[PDB]
Design an enzyme around this catalytic site. Structure first.
Site, PDB file in Angstrom:
ATOM      1  N   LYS A  13       0.793  -1.230  -0.055  1.00 33.81           N
ATOM      2  CA  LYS A  13       0.005   0.107  -0.051  1.00 33.81           C
ATOM      3  C   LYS A  13       0.999   1.380  -0.080  1.00 33.81           C
ATOM      4  O   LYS A  13       0.605   2.087  -0.752  1.00 33.81           O
ATOM      5  CB  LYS A  13      -0.732   0.083   1.235  1.00 33.81           C
ATOM      6  CG  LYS A  13      -1.650  -1.188   1.363  1.00 33.81           C
ATOM      7  CD  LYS A  13      -2.948  -1.121   2.393  1.00 33.81           C
ATOM      8  CE  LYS A  13      -2.365  -0.896   3.672  1.00 33.81           C
ATOM      9  NZ  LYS A  13      -1.560  -1.754   4.374  1.00 33.81           N
ATOM     10  N   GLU A  73       0.409   6.533  10.742  1.00 31.89           N
ATOM     11  CA  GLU A  73       1.404   5.868  10.193  1.00 31.89           C
ATOM     12  C   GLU A  73       2.535   5.890  10.724  1.00 31.89           C
ATOM     13  O   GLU A  73       2.848   6.407  11.789  1.00 31.89           O
ATOM     14  CB  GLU A  73       1.510   6.047   8.708  1.00 31.89           C
ATOM     15  CG  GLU A  73       0.255   5.184   7.975  1.00 31.89           C
ATOM     16  CD  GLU A  73       0.688   3.778   8.060  1.00 31.89           C
ATOM     17  OE1 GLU A  73       1.779   3.140   7.556  1.00 31.89           O
ATOM     18  OE2 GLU A  73      -0.352   3.097   8.646  1.00 31.89           O
ATOM     19  N   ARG A  74       3.824   5.217  10.194  1.00 25.34           N
ATOM     20  CA  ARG A  74       5.002   5.496  10.774  1.00 25.34           C
ATOM     21  C   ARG A  74       5.697   6.641  10.407  1.00 25.34           C
ATOM     22  O   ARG A  74       5.342   7.526   9.601  1.00 25.34           O
ATOM     23  CB  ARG A  74       6.047   4.127   9.988  1.00 25.34           C
ATOM     24  CG  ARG A  74       5.532   2.984  10.418  1.00 25.34           C
ATOM     25  CD  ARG A  74       6.356   2.013   9.294  1.00 25.34           C
ATOM     26  NE  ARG A  74       5.665   0.656   9.397  1.00 25.34           N
ATOM     27  CZ  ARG A  74       4.628   0.132   8.808  1.00 25.34           C
ATOM     28  NH1 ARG A  74       3.876   0.982   8.149  1.00 25.34           N
ATOM     29  NH2 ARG A  74       4.168  -1.159   9.161  1.00 25.34           N
TER      30      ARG A  74
HETATM   31  N1  LIG Z   1       6.738  -2.976  -6.273  1.00 25.45           N
HETATM   32  C1  LIG Z   1       7.467  -3.521  -5.380  1.00 25.45           C
HETATM   33  N2  LIG Z   1       8.703  -4.243  -5.673  1.00 25.45           N
HETATM   34  C2  LIG Z   1       9.442  -4.764  -4.703  1.00 25.45           C
HETATM   35  N3  LIG Z   1       9.033  -4.872  -3.298  1.00 25.45           N
HETATM   36  C3  LIG Z   1       8.118  -4.153  -2.808  1.00 25.45           C
HETATM   37  C4  LIG Z   1       7.036  -3.708  -3.917  1.00 25.45           C
HETATM   38  N4  LIG Z   1       5.987  -3.268  -3.284  1.00 25.45           N
HETATM   39  C5  LIG Z   1       6.043  -3.693  -2.040  1.00 25.45           C
HETATM   40  N5  LIG Z   1       7.374  -4.156  -1.880  1.00 25.45           N
HETATM   41  C6  LIG Z   1       7.808  -4.896  -0.574  1.00 25.45           C
HETATM   42  O1  LIG Z   1       6.621  -4.707   0.378  1.00 25.45           O
HETATM   43  C7  LIG Z   1       7.551  -4.199   1.671  1.00 25.45           C
HETATM   44  C8  LIG Z   1       6.340  -3.122   2.332  1.00 25.45           C
HETATM   45  O2  LIG Z   1       5.472  -2.831   1.649  1.00 25.45           O
HETATM   46  P1  LIG Z   1       4.284  -1.484   2.036  1.00 25.45           P
HETATM   47  O3  LIG Z   1       3.584  -1.213   0.862  1.00 25.45           O
HETATM   48  O4  LIG Z   1       5.161  -0.664   2.575  1.00 25.45           O
HETATM   49  O5  LIG Z   1       3.567  -2.107   3.167  1.00 25.45           O
HETATM   50  P2  LIG Z   1       2.017  -1.527   3.583  1.00 25.45           P
HETATM   51  O6  LIG Z   1       1.134  -1.843   2.566  1.00 25.45           O
HETATM   52  O7  LIG Z   1       1.712  -2.339   4.915  1.00 25.45           O
HETATM   53  O8  LIG Z   1       2.356  -0.119   3.802  1.00 25.45           O
HETATM   54  C9  LIG Z   1       8.424  -3.339   1.294  1.00 25.45           C
HETATM   55  O9  LIG Z   1       9.480  -3.168   2.189  1.00 25.45           O
HETATM   56  C10 LIG Z   1       8.975  -3.846   0.275  1.00 25.45           C
HETATM   57  O10 LIG Z   1      10.047  -4.732   0.031  1.00 25.45           O
HETATM   58 MG   LIG Z   2       1.776   1.249   4.850  1.00 26.25          MG
END
Ligand SMILES: Nc1ncnc2c1ncn2[C@@H]1O[C@H](COP(=O)(O)OP(=O)(O)O)[C@@H](O)[C@H]1O
Ligand SMILES: [Mg+2]
Ligand SMILES: Nc1ncnc2c1ncn2[C@@H]1O[C@H](COP(=O)(O)OP(=O)(O)OP(=O)(O)O)[C@@H](O)[C@H]1O
Ligand SMILES: [Mg+2]
Lengths: 345, 469, 517, 50, 348, 50
Positions: free
Chosen positions: B160, B186-187
């Site tokens: 996300k 959020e963080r």
């Molecule tokens: N397009 C992408 N390519 C590679 N890794 C991804 C991608 N999208 C997400 N990730 C992995 O997912 C982890 C966390 O995703 P994130 O979207 O920050 O979580 P959330 O949806 O809970 O906020 C990231 O550290 C990354 O390593």
């Molecule tokens: Mg997030």
């Protein structure tokens, strides 16, 4: 569909213009009535115009209202009516200092009851063979207080009560009845009633003094000191029994709203006579002839003798607004202005 | 005088007593003082309930540690207000409206209450204009609405935040209007990351950031979304030019409302949520909208607790959105990024009357192929693929190539794969997936479809593995 | 052109005729207030469900009554309620204006127009909680209410007085089914016959305002707002409006039903009304049961749905056809509110996400979808061409495991497999494109009569459309016979068969080959 | 469709502006009666001609 | 002087305060008046609990919309009583005994309380007996028990109403008996349909219909089975007649009991049903029995939530069922009437 | 991020028992040296796909 859309916008802006027209219309009418009724005679003209509508207001199926007897759930009521009948039998026994010391000792033993909750729990059991209870109470103050005091406490604890605060407030209530009879003998019943009402006015309108009297945990010696002191700051309160009532009531406030507790005191004082309170509001005080008119028409309406309380407020812009218990007859012209304003198309 | 007095302090909920007649209205802002020198501050309290007998139950926006019973509580006579105007752009703000990077900035601006009523129904207008992002899966199966309500659903840590950063890179970098970013519970590391990365891309000068993060008490996490939404509503109603509103894990609004619902004296609802769940979510989500002639392209991230899309919070959020990109952990576990579930995601402008006949036909064919593959997966796992038909084996090869070609190397994921990002126009996406569904690339291995852009990237990576097309 | 002097005259007559007789009012006082609920001490003579008026034109409903206070639900603008305000007694239970002036309007759950097109001319008022028709006031459901959808009209017929539940997860096409059902009544409306006209009411509970705008736009583009009212309690409204919106929509449409008219009422997401009522009941601190529901939620929904009746000829013969909508979660039809509304209604249309993705749209599961009224709500033509459909579809669904071993199947098994595939392609339908009953009869005659066995399964849809198009251009008399006689005679069957043969020899498939036997 | 669109949009714009001109130019002429209607409203609310 | 008054109104739950020596017994029927002319009616309340301080908590049987605090409440002195006798045959009643097709009919009959006790242990039959209906499939593969309970698992379009009329005919012509139909949570459309079919087949003169409909508060849906069972008990014990009692969806009786339990503030058991689920099911099913040569045989439609036969409601119901008849659609399509599935049906 | 360890992967001999599919670090290459950032570029995705 486009034609419908243009008709929509035309009609909606039309209604808008209509609304802001009517709003300034009611504004203009408001200032017109405000500068007209500035005539001190026209206020009386308006109020005694409303008085004939009051003359064409009959009838009303009113019911007698009680100070706290209508507040206790059940079991306590029967007990309260039994005890008020017992005190009505007692009514002619005591003398002047007799009654005043009765009140003092009864409020003192009320403090004593609220000081030991467990003994109140014990004496407030709704059991049949209540005789040990009565022993208990005399064991508490065998040689401490007067004899008819102990007798009425015996017949009180003899009764059944749905709770503990019911008896606690009942002894306060019978002490207040004693003070009411004391004031009655002196023949100042309407005087004491209306002076309690006026003190309630000055207590509510500046509620700072009310709140600083509502301190639950703080000891009450400074409370009554403060209170009487503020009262006899002027001597427009020549009567001392009012001060006795209010003092021995504030002694056991128990977190009650003072600005409502004093109204409660005045209302039980008038209820002793069987009358019904009726608060009123207007912009200027009327002649006592108009007060007689008001009392007679309100008595005709509610089928009971009634007392009034005229709380001056000019912002009501003439006319009266009366409230009897939990219903209201609102004839002041400012309320009609607000109505015609809010009911604009 | 006419001040209050603290009576009870149970965590973040504070009871205050006022004199008769001086009771503050609902949602007013009161100020109390904490004088302990290590924690000295001014508590802001938002009136939540009228408890009767002149009592008032308020929610604190700062931690109540150090608050004494009986201290003075000053009624400000108004609700919480935030600074508004074209001068909030380029600055990080608080849930209270305080500038973080330059304190005192904005105290001389116009201040708007953070509580609004949603626009009247006669001002609402459906939006059916496509917002071309550049992602294959988004442009194909979940076409975003320009001026409409978009959301990204997903469990804890799927895609996300990276997807919202990607969309800030794609949509907001070359925008002709204003951007508002609400970080709701959020963080803080991610908030600083976004601040720095918007300062790098020269986008910060057009963006207004409002942060209330996870370390804040539930009042801040409950009101920060309203603060940022008030800033966006000012940019939409007064200035009137093309607002973008991003919100990270808006759910945190629901969760913060749920953390204090029992302390406010409300019986809990089904899954431990507040009884007023849908009502508060509607009061908030109905202000995030485009009126007639005034546009707000909204984009929210919605956390799905424990990957359960039947949880009442996402299930209630689903009804307020025009486009939903729903991320799965099953697609995250396979290495496919973005981890969009093509069978669960949806859009309202996926209509032959909006996106055209060929776009719609290709999207429906992709969805049918992927559904047939999901139906065959269990058979293939137990009995083996050789048990299927020849039609079904053909479809399974096509479906694996298709589900790998929906993935893409995003611009915001270079930090996770070292690989630069790609952008694919919508027509190239349509024609590429048309060729996939027809079977023009059934001879290229399953790789060479994985984390690439258009058809040229496909040719490059296919020849890198010894194949053609 | 604007009538400004008329605007003068209106408020002129209003103020020149204004009067407010100072009558004795019974007032109470707000003691506490929070989350849309207000407790009011006083008001001894207030009755249950009575409307109360707070200061500022705010409305409430007195739900909880006890010896201490009165727990009332605020119907909007709740942030204006304070401790100490006075509450006036109205003396009335919730009533709603009813009349023909509501056709084409979008209104509150109070009868107030929220579209902006001016006030609504109301015939009379009607209480929200009037009793349903007696068990001796009703009459057997016999007249069909054509939804225009082949799957429903053929497999799960709906009568005039029936309550059919459209139940499905989400984004499966429930709103689409109900909007098509509304749009199909346009030709019934153009007939001018009060025995054929169906007035439509659409209740939108808990929906985003832009979704209600889109629904109204779809209804306008199809000319369906000449007879449709929209009672909207949007997502931003109080829980009181979301709880009262179906009862407002059903109070309207009963004024029509008791006038001898026929109405169709759609309750979009009764689940959201259930959640609003649960919020209200949990804020009033009533005992919660399964999923925290108040314990009288089955009553909440059955009291509403038992008012969709088919009155007797002694009462006018009117009818109210209910289409409630339920959103399950993960196809959990065994949840609490789905269980309740499945138990209440006369039949269920189960829409599924898996079927939706497979290209089966409308995604109705014809295996588990039922109608307890049945063929009694079908014309003889549709009743006879669709009887050969359920068994064929069941045989296809039980044979589709052998779809890849037709070589090892009996000739009858393979014939059933192919006929079932053609029939599944026959029940598909575009969105916002409802078909009149005679065209559905001709389509299902194509399907069940064997006239699609020559067409490739990937062409059936097109073929069907084109054939109907041909019959709408050349042979209108067949459709007119089916429409006026409600049956397909043998002469009409012969004419239709020869028309099909000619069209087949004129039809061009997509594989290149001819579709002639 | 687009022809029926551009025409209705243009005439809608030109009619909106014309109705705006009607509105602003007829807004204040009717205020000649707001005084007397306020007066009769006051007479109604008092119960006397005053 | 001896009447009560309303104190609290919380939906269907109404609290009434009586004088000190006039507290109504549990399960008594009380009468209140709604005078608001639009919703004017006479509420029948059933005393559910004694709360103390002369307060009783009662469940209302009609909707309480329009009730005012302080309204006088009259105590009838007895539980809900239904009219009994031969004259209740051919008519439609509700859970309270009011005739629906002919209002006022039956008011001068004998009236029996719906809360009765099952036969004493001295009077119960220690030997099971088979009820010979005359049907081949039933008498052979699913023999019915005389004075027992038979589950019926037929949906729509499998001839459930036809089998019901058949059983009415057989119990009236082979045993010289009677039928009583309790529609517990009856859809009003299907109730009117059943009424007109029983009137057309001329078997209504052998039946008494008691309808506790779906648009009614949970009280009448909880008590309609007891009303019909009381009519049947009068036909058995007083008239000396074999009776056939058709309880349509006993599950709606269980569900109404669960709703009434939730309204009274009682803590729920497992799954969500009332804490006294088995006690209520027994209090109902133990009066359907054979006694002194005469019997009451009951056929009950059973709903199984989520097809879970271990769900507390069907698991509690099946503790009393002696046979099971499953009407199949594959058998109805073959033209086999009655469409009894010979392999899914069973008898004990 | 998260390093999700499993009992199944532990018993299979994979130690540390990190579930490479669902484990992730939200900082990524910023928390690595240049050499490890380049050699372990797409290792997690390669192993998930494997
Ligand atoms: N397009 C992408 N390519 C590679 N890794 C991804 C991608 N999208 C997400 N990730 C992995 O997912 C982890 C966390 O995703 P994130 O979207 O920050 O979580 P959330 O949806 O809970 O906020 C990231 O550290 C990354 O390593
Ligand atoms: Mg997030
Ligand atoms: N018969 C159909 N053929 C093709 N597409 C359809 C059909 N019916 C519906 N759809 C598509 O499905 C999408 C969503 O359907 P719809 O909104 O009617 O479902 P819903 O039951 O209202 O779900 P929700 O209430 O959760 O939005 C629409 O965008 C529409 O284009
Ligand atoms: Mg919908």
């Amino acid at each position: 569909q486009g034609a419908r859309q243009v008709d929509l916008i035309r009609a909606q802006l039309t209604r808008q213009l209509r609304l802001e027209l009517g709003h300034e219309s009611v504004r203009q009418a408001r200032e017109l009535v405000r500068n007209h009724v500035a005539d001190q005679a026209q206020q009386s003209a308006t109020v005694d115009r409303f008085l004939d509508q009051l003359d064409a207001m009959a009838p009303a199926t009113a019911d007698v209202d009680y100070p706290l007897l209508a507040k206790m759930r059940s079991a306590s009521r029967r007990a309260l009516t039994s005890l008020v009948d017992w005190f009505g039998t007692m009514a002619q026994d005591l003398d002047h200092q007799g009654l005043t010391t009765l009140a003092g000792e009864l409020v003192s033993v009320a403090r004593l009851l609220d000081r030991e909750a467990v003994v109140t729990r014990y004496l407030t059991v709704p059991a049949e063979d209540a005789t040990p209870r009565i022993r208990l109470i005399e064991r508490l103050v065998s040689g401490k207080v007067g004899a008819p005091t102990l007798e009425v406490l015996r017949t009180a604890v003899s009764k059944r009560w749905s709770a503990n605060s019911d008896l606690i407030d009942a002894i306060e209530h019978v002490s207040r009845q004693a003070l009411l009879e004391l004031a009655e003998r002196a023949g100042q019943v309407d005087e004491v009633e209306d002076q309690l009402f006026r003190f309630s006015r000055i207590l509510d309108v500046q509620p700072r003094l009310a709140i600083l009297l509502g301190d639950c945990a703080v000891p009450a010696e400074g409370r009554v000191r403060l209170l009487r002191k503020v009262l006899e700051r002027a001597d427009s309160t020549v009567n001392p029994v009012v001060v006795a009532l209010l003092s021995h009531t504030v002694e056991l406030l128990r977190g009650q709203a003072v600005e409502e507790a004093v109204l409660f005191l005045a209302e039980v004082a008038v209820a002793r006579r069987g009358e019904i309170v009726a608060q009123v509001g207007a912009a200027a005080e009327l002649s006592d002839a108009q007060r007689t008119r008001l009392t007679e028409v309100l008595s005709r309406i509610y089928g009971h003798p009634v007392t009034v309380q005229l709380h001056i407020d000019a912002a009501l812009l003439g006319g009266l607004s009366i409230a009897v218990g939990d219903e209201v007859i609102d004839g002041t012209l400012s309320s009609r202005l607000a109505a015609a304003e809010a009911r604009l198309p | 005088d006419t001040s209050g007095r603290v009576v009870r302090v149970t965590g973040p909920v504070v009871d205050v007593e006022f004199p008769r007649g001086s009771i503050p209205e609902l949602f007013n802002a009161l100020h109390a003082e904490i004088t302990f020198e290590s924690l000295a501050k001014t508590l802001t309290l938002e009136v939540a309930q009228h408890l009767g007998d002149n009592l008032v139950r308020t929610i604190s926006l700062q931690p109540t540690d150090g608050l004494v019973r009986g201290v003075e509580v000053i009624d400000t006579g108004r609700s919480i207000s935030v600074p508004v105007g074209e001068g909030v752009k380029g600055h990080v703000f608080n849930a209270l409206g305080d500038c973080l990077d330059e304190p005192g900035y904005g105290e001389k601006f116009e201040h708007w209450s953070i509580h609004r009523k949603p626009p009247a129904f006669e001002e609402l207008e459906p939006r059916t204009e496509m917002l071309e992002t550049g992602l294959k899966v988004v442009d194909l199966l979940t076409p975003y609405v320009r001026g409409g309500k978009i959301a990204l659903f997903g469990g804890a840590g799927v895609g996300k935040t990276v997807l919202i950063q990607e969309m800030i890179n794609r949509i907001a970098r070359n925008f002709g209007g204003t951007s508002v970013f609400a970080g709701v519970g959020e963080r803080t590391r991610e908030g600083n990351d976004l601040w720095v990365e918007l300062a790098e891309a020269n986008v910060l000068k057009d963006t207004a950031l409002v942060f209330g993060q996870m370390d804040e008490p539930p009042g801040t996490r409950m009101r920060v979304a309203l603060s940022a939404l008030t800033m966006a509503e000012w940019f939409r109603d007064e200035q009137g030019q093309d607002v973008l509103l991003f919100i990270d894990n808006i759910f945190r609004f629901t969760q913060a409302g749920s953390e204090v619902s029992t302390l406010l004296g409300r019986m809990p609802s089904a899954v431990g949520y507040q009884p007023t769940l849908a009502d508060e979510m509607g009061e908030l989500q109905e202000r995030i909208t485009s009126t007639r002639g005034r546009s707000i392209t909204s984009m929210q991230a919605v956390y799905v607790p424990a990957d359960d899309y039947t949880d009442p919070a996402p299930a209630t959020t689903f009804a307020h959105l025009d486009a939903t990109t729903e991320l799965s952990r099953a697609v995250f576990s396979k290495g496919i990024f973005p981890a969009v579930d093509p069978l669960a995601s949806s859009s309202t402008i996926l209509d032959p009357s909006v996106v055209g006949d060929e776009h719609y036909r290709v999207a429906q064919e992709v969805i049918r192929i992927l559904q047939r593959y999901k139906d065959l997966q269990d058979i293939i796992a137990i009995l083996g693929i050789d048990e299927l038909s020849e039609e079904d084996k053909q479809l399974v090869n096509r479906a694996r190539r298709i589900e790998r070609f929906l993935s893409q190397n995003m611009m915001a994921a270079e930090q996770f794969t070292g690989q630069p990002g790609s952008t694919v126009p919508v027509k190239e996406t349509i024609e590429a997936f048309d060729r996939l569904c027809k079977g023009d690339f059934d001879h290229v291995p399953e790789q060479a479809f994985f984390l690439i852009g258009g058809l040229d990237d496909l040719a490059k990576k296919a020849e890198s593995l010894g194949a053609k097309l | 052109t604007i009538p400004a002097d008329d605007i003068q005259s209106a408020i002129e007559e209003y103020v020149s005729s204004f009067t407010a007789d100072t009558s004795r009012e019974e007032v109470g006082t707000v003691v506490d207030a929070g989350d849309g609920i207000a407790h009011v001490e006083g008001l001894p003579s207030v009755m249950t469900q009575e409307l109360l008026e707070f200061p500022g034109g705010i409305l409430g409903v007195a739900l909880n009554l006890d010896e201490h206070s009165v727990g009332a639900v605020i119907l909007g603008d709740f942030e204006n309620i304070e401790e100490g305000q006075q509450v006036k007694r109205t003396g009335e239970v919730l009533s709603v204006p009813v009349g023909d002036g509501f056709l084409g309007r979008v209104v509150n759950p109070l009868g107030q127009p929220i579209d902006g097109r001016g006030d609504v001319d109301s015939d009379t008022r009607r209480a929200l909680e009037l009793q349903a028709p007696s068990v001796v006031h009703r009459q057997g459901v016999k007249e069909p209410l054509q939804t225009g959808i082949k799957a429903i009209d053929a497999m799960t017929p709906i009568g005039r007085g029936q309550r059919q539940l459209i139940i499905g997860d989400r984004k499966t096409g429930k709103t689409a089914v109900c909007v098509d059902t509304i749009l199909n009544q346009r030709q019934n409306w153009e007939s001018g016959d009060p025995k054929k006209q169906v007035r439509c009411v659409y209740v939108a509970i808990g929906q985003k305002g832009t979704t209600i705008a889109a629904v109204r736009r779809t209804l306008e583009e199809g000319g369906a707002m000449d007879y449709t009212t929209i009672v909207a309690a949007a997502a931003s409204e109080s829980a009181g409006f979301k709880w009262l919106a179906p009862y407002t929509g059903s109070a309207i449409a009963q004024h029509w039903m008791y006038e001898g008219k026929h109405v169709l009422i759609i309750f979009d997401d009764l689940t959201k009304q259930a959640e609003a009522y649960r919020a209200i009941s949990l804020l009033l601190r009533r005992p919660p049961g399964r999923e925290a529901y108040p314990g009288d939620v089955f009553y909440l929904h059955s009291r509403l749905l038992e008012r969709c009746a088919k009155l007797s000829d002694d009462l006018g013969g009117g009818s109210l056809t209910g289409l409630p909508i339920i959103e399950t979660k993960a196809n959990d039809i065994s949840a609490y509110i789905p269980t309740n509304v499945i138990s209440i209604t006369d039949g269920q249309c189960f829409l599924e996400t898996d079927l939706f993705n497979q290209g089966v749209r409308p995604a109705i599961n014809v295996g588990v979808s039922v109608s307890r009224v049945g063929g009694a709500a079908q014309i003889k033509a549709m009743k006879e061409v669709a009887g050969s459909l359920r068994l064929d579809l069941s045989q296809y669904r039980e044979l589709e495991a052998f779809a890849a071993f037709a070589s090892d199947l009996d000739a009858a098994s393979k014939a059933q497999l192919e006929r079932g595939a053609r029939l599944v392609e026959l029940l598909k339908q575009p969105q916002s494109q409802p078909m009149p009953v005679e065209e559905q009869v001709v389509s299902i005659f194509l399907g069940t009569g064997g006239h699609l066995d020559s067409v490739p399964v990937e062409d059936v849809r097109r073929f069907e459309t084109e054939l109907l198009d041909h019959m709408r251009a050349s042979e209108e008399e067949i459709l007119t016979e089916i429409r006026d006689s409600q049956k397909l005679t043998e002469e009409a069957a012969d004419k239709l068969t020869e028309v099909i043969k000619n069209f087949k020899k004129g039809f061009a498939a997509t594989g290149g080959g001819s579709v002639v036997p | 469709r687009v022809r029926a669109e551009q025409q209705v949009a243009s005439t809608l714009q030109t009619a909106h502006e014309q109705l705006k001109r009607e509105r602003d130019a007829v807004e204040l002429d009717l205020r000649a009666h707001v005084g007397t209607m306020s007066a009769t409203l006051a007479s109604r609310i008092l119960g006397v001609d005053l």
